[PDB]
Amino acid sequence: SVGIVYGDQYRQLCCSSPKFGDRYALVMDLINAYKLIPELSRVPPLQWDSPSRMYEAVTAFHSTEYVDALKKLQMLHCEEKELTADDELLMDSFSLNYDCPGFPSVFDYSLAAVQGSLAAASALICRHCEVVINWGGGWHHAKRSEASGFCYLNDIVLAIHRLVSSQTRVLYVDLDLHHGDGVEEAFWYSPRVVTFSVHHASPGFFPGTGTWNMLPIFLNGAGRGRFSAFNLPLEEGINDLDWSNAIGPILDSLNIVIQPSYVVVQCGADCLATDPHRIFRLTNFYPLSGYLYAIKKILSWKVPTLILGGGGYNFPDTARLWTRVTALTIEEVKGKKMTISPEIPEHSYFSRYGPDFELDIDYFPDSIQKHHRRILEQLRNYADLNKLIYDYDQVYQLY
Numbered sequence: 001s002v003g004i005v006y007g008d009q010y011r012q013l014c015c016s017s018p019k020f021g022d023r024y025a026l027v028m029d030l031i032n033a034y035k036l037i038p039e040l041s042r043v044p045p046l047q048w049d050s051p052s053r054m055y056e057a058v059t060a061f062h063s064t065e066y067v068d069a070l071k072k073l074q075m076l077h078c079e080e081k082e083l084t085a086d087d088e089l090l091m092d093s094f095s096l097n098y099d100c101p102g103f104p105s106v107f108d109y110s111l112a113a114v115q116g117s118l119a120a121a122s123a124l125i126c127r128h129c130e131v132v133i134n135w136g137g138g139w140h141h142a143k144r145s146e147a148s149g150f151c152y153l154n155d156i157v158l159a160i161h162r163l164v165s166s167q168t169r170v171l172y173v174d175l176d177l178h179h180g181d182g183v184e185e186a187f188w189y190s191p192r193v194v195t196f197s198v199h200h201a202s203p204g205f206f207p208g209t210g211t212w213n214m215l216p217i218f219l220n221g222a223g224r225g226r227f228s229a230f231n232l233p234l235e236e237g238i239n240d241l242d243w244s245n246a247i248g249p250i251l252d253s254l255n256i257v258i259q260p261s262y263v264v265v266q267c268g269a270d271c272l273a274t275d276p277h278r279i280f281r282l283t284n285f286y287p288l289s290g291y292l293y294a295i296k297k298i299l300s301w302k303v304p305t306l307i308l309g310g311g312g313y314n315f316p317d318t319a320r321l322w323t324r325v326t327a328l329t330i331e332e333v334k335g336k337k338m339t340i341s342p343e344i345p346e347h348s349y350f351s352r353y354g355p356d357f358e359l360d361i362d363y364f365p366d367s368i369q370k371h372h373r374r375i376l377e378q379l380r381n382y383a384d385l386n387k388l389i390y391d392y393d394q395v396y397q398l399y
């Protein structure tokens with residue numbers, strides 16, 4: 001059974017931010033326009049019995065003062081007096097500024113993604129769904145007491161924390177163009193949550209982490225979590241096939257050696273060739289899309305899986321991609337062919353898909369070898385440190 005997180009309130013809140021506007025509404029309407037909803041189990045966002053229970057849930061990761069600050073930021077943007085100097089300084093100490101501005105619904109908006117991904121985790125734990133999709137979640141940059149990259153609350157960390165706390169191991173796979181620093185940082189000392197992020201990194205590129213550190217080396221966890229944080233930084237321009245070749249053997253080896261109880265996939269869409277970032281050249285093509293390749297491989301493991309959204313700034317193209325990921329998930333889990341018309345069906349947001357209105361995004365197309373050796377060695381070190389039973393010939397064979 002494949003779940004998907006949505007709801008009427010949930011939709012309004014996910015579409016209330018200045019940065020991502022109505023992206024979520026395009027995504028869910030396209031999924032709906034392709035008639036996939038009847039195939040999917042609706043998963044309602046989690047709600048709480050009281051303010052105290054909500055605070056308890058969220059401060060599982062975030063500090064109480066940060067949460068307080070985030071709530072006050074909302075109240076302040078709901079009045080039209082300027083913030084006092086004192087309020088500005090409080091907000092600054094939490095990076096609630098610049099690229100993480102306040103807006104009238106900023107706490108409700110951020111909390112929604114958390115409600116969504118907590119319900120997704122619970123649906124997996126109680127075995128109601130084999131896979132749950134939350135395209136309203138995926139905010140991997142938020143820290144304990146710090147907003148970052150328009151992430152205010154880290155819904156992924158909270159979902160993952162709920163999963164491990166239910167010999168439980170979680171594999172977190174971050175496909176976003178950006179390094180999943182928040183999630184990685186959160187589980188830096190935890191061997192039972194292995195994080196793996198593939199991303200672009202270059203000097204000055206957000207957020208700066210997930211690459212060689214200041215010959216220099218890769219940090220990879222600490223304490224009992226040593227060797228438990230995996231990173232593959234790629235240079236710009238990479239396409240579907242090279243991207244797929246770069247991460248394929250790593251995903252497979254991670255699964256084999258770690259044997260996770262849950263997989264949590266962040267599927268931020270800013271790797272698309274047509275994203276305004278224009279760094280990687282991935283597509284949503286399904287004849288092959290790096291995304292669809294990675295998700296299919298992960299789903300072939302038959303491990304209960306959380307699939308989340310994230311970045312993606314070309315809203316129709318993000319919708320095009322996540323519609324195909326959603327179709328792919330249904331087909332792989334329920335074992336039934338999903339046929340999708342090559343052109344966008346008429347629906348409320350049909351016009352946004354110009355000019356050609358088809359489902360493919362409008363695009364025509366040794367360093368990695370060093371990384372594989374480096375990571376296999378980290379995986380071996382991880383396995384050794386944690387006394388796991390790995391077959392070194394089979395893992396090595398994958399490369």
Ligand SMILES: O=C(/C=C/c1ccccc1Cl)NO
Nearest residue numbers: 099149150176178206310311
């Ligand atoms: O999409 C992202 C980050 C986007 C970003 C980066 C730097 C500054 C602001 C933003 Cl929204 N990562 O998930």
Ligand SMILES: [K+]
Nearest residue numbers: 174176178198
């Ligand atoms: K990533």
Ligand SMILES: [K+]
Nearest residue numbers: 187190193228
């Ligand atoms: K870890």
Ligand SMILES: [Zn+2]
Nearest residue numbers: 176177178311
């Ligand atoms: Zn991103």
